[PDB]
Amino acid sequence: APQQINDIVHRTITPLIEQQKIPGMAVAVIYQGKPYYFTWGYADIAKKQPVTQQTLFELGSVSKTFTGVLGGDAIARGEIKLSDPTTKYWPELTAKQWNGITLLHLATYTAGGLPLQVPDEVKSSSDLLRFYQNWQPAWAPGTQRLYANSSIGLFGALAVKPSGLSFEQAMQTRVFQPLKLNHTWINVPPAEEKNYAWGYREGKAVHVSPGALDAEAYGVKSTIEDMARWVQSNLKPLDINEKTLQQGIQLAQSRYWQTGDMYQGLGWEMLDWPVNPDSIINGSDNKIALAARPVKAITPPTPAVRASWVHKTGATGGFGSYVAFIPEKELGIVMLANKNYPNPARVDAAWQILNALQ
Ligand SMILES: CCc1c(C)[nH]n(-c2nnn[nH]2)c1=O
């Protein structure tokens, strides 16, 4: 790597790893389009397996960016529209509260207070129907944003219905394969188990537990190399040769709602660059609370803004991930760790690195 990149990354990440007691970490910096990789520590402490460029990490909620793009691709294919009522694709959802709740609301956490998590008690698909039928919105559709797995999770499941593909088959065939993400998985195959890092929570080795709508909301596992390629793809969608996928990426970065300084896309979240680091790290957008926030509709949605800080944080019980990029600068970062450590620390490190290189 160029010495500037080497220096900025190591001087930022080394103290981070120390301060946060992170067992293993992989970092990719995309600079002028090209990827540079950095690894530290352990994928498996007990078996003394190092983190490599081939190590799989649980992305947690960074998975929502894949779901958002897959949904965008389905829009481009003419299979779904974000203006469609939810009931068009799940007509068994007959309870009145669903009148006026569209696929847009589901994708953008604006349905009226769908809960953060699907209850673990929800095990079957009749359990799932009951859950959504019985849910009572706190607010009218399109008035408040409440970050929710049960919201975008449902969007993902419904978005693939017309295709007749399972969510996993659709994601594999329409997103992973075309982008040559050959080591990115919703379900880790036995062949790849040697590469699957353990997460660490309170000193224990843990992997994500199965749950309803897990694939759609938090279920993807990936390598630092594939995640670098994912960032590249989202930085420059015009290089993508599959028409609907190029267009799906663009739709995922459209600005649908505004809360404070943040704009809600499909999976991706955006702020205008230059960004004041404070907001994302400290004020209202730092993600330590669970926050209900009134939204302003962007009517119509603003197409992908090049001068944006586009990002997504992600966690599982044992993993902490972060992705951020600035399209106008051809600049990006991926940080994958096998410990769930505070979001503000992620954002700070990412800003510190990207700011120095921009
Ligand atoms: C997205 C909600 C969630 C988090 C943050 N962790 N987690 C989990 N970890 N292991 N099994 N489930 C979850 O299901």
Side-chain angles (χ1 to χ4, degrees):
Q3 197 173 17
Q4 181 176 28
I5 299 172
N6 180 82
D7 292 339
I8 187 61
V9 171
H10 281 99
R11 287 166 192 176
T12 305
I13 303 298
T14 300
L16 179 67
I17 292 173
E18 181 32 27
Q19 290 153 357
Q20 301 299 152
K21 311 297 230 277
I22 292 165
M25 196 154 187
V27 172
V29 171
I30 302 75
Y31 176 86
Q32 292 174 191
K34 297 186 253 167
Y36 304 92
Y37 304 106
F38 306 89
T39 61
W40 297 262
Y42 289 84
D44 182 333
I45 299 166
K47 292 185 178 177
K48 303 169 187 192
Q49 299 306 296
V51 174
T52 69
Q53 297 174 196
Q54 310 314 325
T55 302
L56 294 164
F57 292 82
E58 294 171 5
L59 302 180
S61 294
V62 172
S63 307
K64 288 174 179 69
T65 66
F66 290 97
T67 301
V69 166
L70 182 70
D73 176 78
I75 300 158
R77 287 169 180 271
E79 286 170 352
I80 66 160
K81 307 187 311 288
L82 286 172
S83 56
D84 287 333
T86 301
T87 54
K88 186 174 169 159
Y89 304 99
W90 204 4
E92 299 69 40
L93 207 54
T94 55
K96 21 204 12 202
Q97 72 268 20
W98 288 95
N99 296 341
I101 297 175
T102 65
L103 292 186
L104 175 67
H105 295 135
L106 292 185
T108 57
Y109 324 116
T110 53
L114 277 167
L116 176 62
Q117 306 117 322
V118 183
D120 295 334
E121 307 88 77
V122 178
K123 302 287 194 204
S124 65
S125 40
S126 290
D127 282 347
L128 199 64
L129 178 59
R130 265 189 295 280
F131 169 70
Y132 288 106
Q133 279 284 76
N134 292 152
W135 163 76
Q136 297 304 131
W139 321 296
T143 62
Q144 299 204 48
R145 177 188 184 271
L146 186 68
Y147 185 75
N149 296 295
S150 71
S151 192
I152 192 169
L154 184 54
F155 169 76
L158 298 180
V160 299
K161 268 183 158 184
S163 78
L165 303 165
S166 73
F167 184 84
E168 195 185 9
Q169 308 171 302
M171 189 68 77
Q172 285 171 155
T173 55
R174 301 178 163 190
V175 178
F176 297 167
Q177 281 166 27
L179 295 183
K180 292 170 181 207
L181 309 180
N182 304 323
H183 300 83
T184 298
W185 313 106
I186 284 157
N187 297 289
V188 179
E192 315 298 331
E193 289 182 11
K194 69 182 198 292
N195 302 297
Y196 192 15
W198 283 97
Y200 293 88
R201 183 177 180 161
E202 294 185 70
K204 311 263 158 230
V206 293
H207 279 146
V208 67
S209 300
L213 300 173
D214 55 2
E216 296 84 348
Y218 57 89
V220 181
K221 300 90 188 176
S222 195
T223 65
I224 199 67
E225 293 190 354
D226 278 10
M227 286 309 292
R229 191 158 182 85
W230 181 235
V231 173
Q232 290 174 311
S233 301
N234 283 267
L235 275 166
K236 254 170 116 175
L238 298 175
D239 287 356
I240 291 144
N241 316 300
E242 293 75 18
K243 287 322 165 175
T244 59
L245 183 56
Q246 165 179 120
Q247 276 122 78
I249 292 151
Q250 291 173 124
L251 290 168
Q253 275 174 67
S254 295
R255 298 178 174 186
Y256 297 94
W257 307 93
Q258 187 184 357
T259 163
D261 295 343
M262 79 80 74
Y263 300 95
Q264 187 62 58
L266 307 172
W268 295 112
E269 297 159 16
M270 293 82 59
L271 299 87
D272 286 307
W273 182 261
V275 179
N276 203 290
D278 176 74
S279 59
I280 25 176
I281 308 169
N282 302 308
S284 319
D285 207 21
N286 81 53
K287 323 280 192 180
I288 309 297
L290 186 49
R293 299 273 192 257
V295 283
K296 178 181 79 246
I298 305 291
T299 316
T302 308
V305 176
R306 297 271 294 169
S308 300
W309 176 272
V310 187
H311 76 150
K312 187 70 190 80
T313 192
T316 60
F319 287 83
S321 309
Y322 187 67
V323 178
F325 60 94
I326 310 159
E328 92 163 345
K329 298 173 158 200
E330 307 152 30
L331 188 65
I333 192 177
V334 183
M335 296 155 59
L336 308 177
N338 60 355
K339 184 179 181 282
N340 192 7
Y341 68 100
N343 184 43
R346 311 186 196 177
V347 185
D348 169 73
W351 155 276
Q352 215 171 295
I353 292 159
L354 296 195
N355 182 53
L357 297 174
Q358 61 99 19

